Design a protein around this ligand. Structure first.
Ligand SMILES: OC[C@H]1O[C@@H](O[C@H]2[C@H](O)[C@@H](O)[C@H](O[C@@H]3[C@@H](O)[C@H](O)O[C@H](CO)[C@H]3O)O[C@@H]2CO)[C@H](O)[C@@H](O)[C@@H]1O
Length: 255
């Protein structure tokens, strides 16, 4: 078996420093070397390239075979690479650094609503059963739920509330927390968010990790992005607890 002393490699950042060339420099000749690039990718070859969209420290492992022996180094990637990051994620986060908090558009009509959902034969693309007037859900927990997006190591999201989410009878029946009836009707349900979440954006699909939802519980973590720009995030979702019911939500930046 190779001796940890016999083995070496270089990790050289390119003109794009998020793309790193890994080269076997070991004191023994014609070993077979495999790599763990620290980013979920493994490779085999004397010289391979690794790409890291996100600023972080990463552990690279080279394994030489004659037996097998493994050595590691850490690399620091200094800055997020916009060329390898989902563009809509950067709008959600307000940029490649920092964070951006989004809140219900409570001051304008139509920031929450319900209608035939996209699989329903009556779908018309709008919350045609009920559309919330400005401040219509002031008297419940709905507007206390705020969502922060940030690209600190990955597609990260922070969910803050004051310990409650808003839902209806169908939703309350799927959640363990105590339910209360607030001034706006339906149900507040005790629900404490996890300290950290992730998200994915694939085309117009926004998915939240760990069964998260945008303050209003309808049994799904999948949203359809209808509008996303620096001033507005307009979402549809399809209820998993009331077949064929669709919900609409409009978020704007926290001021
Ligand atoms: O048109 C029949 C259609 O109605 C669905 O139920 C709707 C109902 O029409 C809406 O009036 C109702 O709106 C609720 C608001 O009045 C309330 O103030 O706020 C809550 C949100 O907190 C609104 O839900 O919504 C229900 C859907 O939840 C039926 O479900 C559907 O089967 C039927 O075809």
């Amino acid at each position: 078996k190779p001796q940890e002393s016999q083995l070496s490699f270089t990790a050289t950042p390119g003109s794009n420093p998020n793309v790193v060339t890994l080269k076997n420099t070991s004191s023994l000749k014609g070993l077979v070397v495999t790599w763990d690039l620290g980013n979920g990718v493994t490779a085999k070859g004397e010289e391979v390239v690794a790409s890291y969209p996100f600023a972080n420290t990463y552990t690279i492992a080279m394994t030489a075979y004659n037996g097998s022996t493994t050595i590691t180094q850490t690399i620091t990637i200094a800055n997020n690479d916009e060329s390898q990051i989902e563009p809509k994620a950067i709008i959600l986060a307000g940029g490649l650094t920092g964070s951006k908090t989004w809140v219900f558009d409570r001051a304008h009509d139509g920031h929450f609503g319900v209608g035939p959902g996209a699989g329903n034969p009556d779908y018309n693309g709008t919350p045609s059963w009920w559309s919330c007037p400005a401040e219509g859900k002031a008297e419940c927990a709905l507007y206390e739920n705020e969502f922060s997006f940030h690209l600190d190591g990955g597609y990260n999201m922070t969910w803050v509330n004051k310990g409650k989410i808003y839902t209806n009878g169908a939703g309350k029946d799927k959640l363990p927390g105590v339910a209360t009836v607030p001034g706006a009707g339906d149900f507040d349900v005790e629900y404490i968010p996890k300290e950290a979440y992730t998200f994915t954006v694939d085309g117009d699909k926004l998915k939240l990790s760990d069964d998260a939802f945008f303050g209003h519980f309808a049994g799904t973590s999948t949203y359809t992005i209808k509008t996303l720009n620096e001033n507005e995030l307009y979402l549809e979702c399809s209820s998993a607890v009331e077949s064929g019911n669709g919900w609409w939500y409009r978020f704007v930046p926290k001021k």
